[PDB]
Write a protein that binds this ligand. Structure first.
Ligand SMILES: [Cl-]
Ligand SMILES: [Mg+2]
Lengths: 380, 41
């Protein structure tokens, strides 16, 4: 007996878990009340293992001992040009072991330890498992887990392996764009259609053209940018404010990880706020050298700081349509994934690109992939 | 061979065997199951 099978979006920057019941999916809040959980692992100085919000939130002078973005490495070999590029921007040490990238961190006690990417992802899955168990009031042993459509056999197997290490039998690996389409019930309708999935996550941007034929999907064409996501918009804002603060005080806070962390947290919140407001006030008490930070960001300035990045999202979309020889009008459904898709300028670019067609709506775009996974888990 | 058929035809093959593709989101899932089940039927 497989018990209650849950759906898990094991994401680059954030992860999400849901369960199907009573004709719908319940996206499950974690013990901090959040329906998404950072795909982060860190250690206290005393050697306590933190996963999720606690790991991301932990203020540190040593950023090199916080692990994230393990999905960028999972199932890849050390010599993969993708790995060799990615390790240049990751703050933690990645070392070759067994022809594979391993992650080396301080775990407390003047002890270091090396972890396979899949051991880090197993820790994230453990937290998502615990999240589900607390809600369901029973143990969870089986899951459907999502991956990017471009993942290869080794990457899909390494994801299953992460599941195994976490005590989860991953019954199905399903592609993220397909999961989002399932969330919106697109498999339950009659006829043949073309679906465009526009997925702007925290760290990666994926455009997928799917067909549906008699209720069954096919991933026909993919494109995107694995180094474009919500965090890049945050970084543009970070740079603006670090530069402003230096102009105002003569203080350069970039060498000071704790101040940078505090600013990044408030900038993430401001960005989300600017999807529904035209101004956001960023306030940090004791930001730097005990001095307070107080500045405002307008939606216009946010847009100005990111305009090239926003516009750059349309090129992969054009590439996918060209590759499939589809007119804009041939797209029967547009599915948005990621909270960055709620950014008004991104909505406007997508709407204008598609001649005013309205996307699917009704599911939080940060939750849609998990939602779909949970739908599929619901029949098992 | 299999990859060239319509989904309706893949479902037709499975239905005729009294076999179901449970939680099979994509055409590849139907192709894979028919290949695995073919020596039975
Ligand atoms: Cl993400
Ligand atoms: Mg995602």
């Amino acid at each position: 007996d497989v018990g209650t099978v849950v759906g898990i979006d094991l994401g680059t920057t954030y992860s999400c878990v849901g369960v199907f019941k009573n004709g719908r999916v319940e996206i499950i809040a974690n013990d901090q009340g959040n329906r998404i959980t950072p795909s982060y692992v860190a250690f206290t100085p005393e050697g306590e293992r933190l996963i999720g919000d606690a790991a991301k939130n932990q203020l540190t002078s040593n950023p090199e001992n916080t692990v994230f973005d393990a999905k960028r490495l999972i199932g890849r070999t050390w010599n993969d040009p993708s790995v060799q590029q990615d390790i240049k921007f990751l703050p933690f040490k990645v070392v070759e072991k067994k022809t594979k990238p391993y992650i080396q961190v301080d775990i407390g006690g003047g002890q270091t330890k090396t972890f396979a990417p899949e051991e880090i992802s197993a820790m994230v899955l453990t937290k998502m498992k615990e999240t589900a168990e607390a809600y369901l009031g029973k143990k969870v042993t089986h899951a459907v887990v999502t991956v990017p459509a471009y993942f290869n056999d080794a990457q899909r197997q390494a994801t299953k392996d992460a599941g195994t290490i976490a005590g989860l039998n991953v019954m199905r690996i399903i592609n993220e764009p397909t999961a989002a389409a399932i969330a919106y019930g697109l498999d339950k309708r009659e006829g043949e259609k073309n679906i465009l999935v526009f997925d702007l996550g925290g760290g990666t941007f994926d455009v997928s053209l799917l067909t549906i034929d008699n209720g069954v999907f096919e991933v026909v064409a993919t494109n995107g940018d694995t180094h474009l996501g919500g965090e890049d918009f945050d970084q543009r804002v970070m740079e603006h404010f670090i530069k402003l603060y230096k102009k105002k005080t003569g203080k350069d806070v970039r060498k000071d990880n704790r101040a940078v962390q505090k600013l990044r947290r408030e900038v993430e919140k401001a960005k989300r706020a600017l999807s529904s407001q035209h101004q956001a006030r960023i306030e940090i008490e004791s930001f730097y050298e005990g001095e307070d930070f107080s500045e405002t960001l307008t939606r216009a300035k946010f847009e100005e700081l990111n305009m090239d990045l926003f516009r750059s999202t349309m090129k992969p979309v054009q590439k996918v349509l060209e590759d499939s020889d589809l007119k804009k009008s041939d797209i029967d459904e547009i599915v948005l994934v990621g909270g960055s898709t709620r950014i008004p300028k991104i909505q406007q670019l997508v709407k204008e690109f598609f001649n005013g067609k309205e996307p699917s709506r009704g599911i939080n775009p940060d939750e849609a992939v998990a939602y779909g996974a949970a739908v599929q888990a619901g029949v098992l | 061979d299999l990859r060239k058929m319509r989904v309706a035809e893949l479902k037709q093959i499975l239905h005729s065997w009294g076999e179901e593709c449970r939680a099979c989101a994509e055409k590849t899932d139907y192709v894979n199951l028919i290949q695995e089940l073919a020596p039975k039927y």
